[PDB]
Design a protein around this ligand. Sequence first.
Ligand SMILES: COc1cc(CCNC(=O)c2nc(Cc3ccccc3C(F)(F)F)[nH]c(=O)c2O)ccn1
Ligand SMILES: [Mg+2]
Ligand SMILES: [Mn+2]
Ligand SMILES: [Mn+2]
Length: 180
Amino acid sequence: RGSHMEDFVRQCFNPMIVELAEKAMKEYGEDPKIETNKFAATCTHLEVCFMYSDGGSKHRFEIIEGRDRIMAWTVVNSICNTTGVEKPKFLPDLYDYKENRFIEIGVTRREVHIYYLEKANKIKSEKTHIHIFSFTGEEMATKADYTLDEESRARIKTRLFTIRQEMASRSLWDSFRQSE
Ligand SMILES: COc1cc(CCNC(=O)c2nc(Cc3ccccc3C(F)(F)F)[nH]c(=O)c2O)ccn1
Ligand SMILES: [Mg+2]
Ligand SMILES: [Mn+2]
Ligand SMILES: [Mn+2]
């Protein structure tokens, strides 16, 4: 129960992000006390989605990730019925009103190439945009369209590498990398 990874995640991430990740994991029947690597990954993905939405304009991004399943699906339904974009098979992460498209954010511990391959093979909706970040500073977006400016993506990559460094300083990075 008393794992180093859980305490590190509680010390490293914002309390609201921790609570959101806990709720998202408990909604799918997962315990952050035992599945600590998945807990860290969920916190990281949440923080990345939030930083991504922070970029761009004020009314640019509609945030899907973070809400519970029912409200998230309701928001996607409203977006689809308002704009006319095709309904995605799986719950995306954000919606860009400027580009008028759903965005799926990915955070991987390996090369962005194979991760984007799997993410584009698991979903068949070719309209949804995909954006993958790595823990080493690499990024990969659909049609070479990175949506945001270079500064926001650079901040995201810097935060990711800081998280990796803090994990390695506690001898927890190897297990986290092998978990994925
Ligand atoms: C095809 O994705 C899905 C997605 C859902 C909706 C809820 N989940 C997510 O949102 C989500 N989930 C993962 C990891 C994951 C977890 C469970 C199943 C698949 C995956 C993934 F994405 F690796 F395929 N990472 C993300 O980055 C992310 O956002 C429901 C079903 N499938
Ligand atoms: Mg800290
Ligand atoms: Mn998601
Ligand atoms: Mn995602």
